[PDB]
């Protein structure tokens, strides 16, 4: 990582030695549900 020749002239399957510091993984999912409102109260149609 400290040597641009290596950092910039490398191949598809390799990365920086400093990439081993990327130890966290965050996985998100954005979904639909139904927010129901009735008789003054809210709720979610789908529990799970």
């Amino acid at each position: 990582a400290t040597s641009p020749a290596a950092v910039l002239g490398n191949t598809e399957t390799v990365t920086a030695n400093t990439a081993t510091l990327l130890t966290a993984l965050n996985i998100y999912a954005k979904n639909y549900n139904v927010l129901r409102i009735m008789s003054g109260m809210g709720g979610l149609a789908y529990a799970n």
Partner: protein, 50 residues
């Protein structure tokens, strides 16, 4: 006038006169609004997982 006067003797300052009458009519307000009482199946959902 000199002998028929009322005095607060023993028993007139008893504590139960404040212990028997609750403070509910002096602090509660006439809401006159119905309670929620919503069900749990409507809020939690249908549990489509299984």
């Amino acid at each position: 006038l000199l002998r028929g006067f009322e005095s607060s003797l023993r028993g007139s300052r008893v504590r139960t006169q404040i212990d028997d009458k609750s403070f509910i009519p002096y602090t509660w307000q006439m809401i006159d609004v119905p309670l929620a009482a919503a069900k749990t199946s409507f809020i939690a959902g249908l549990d489509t997982r299984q």
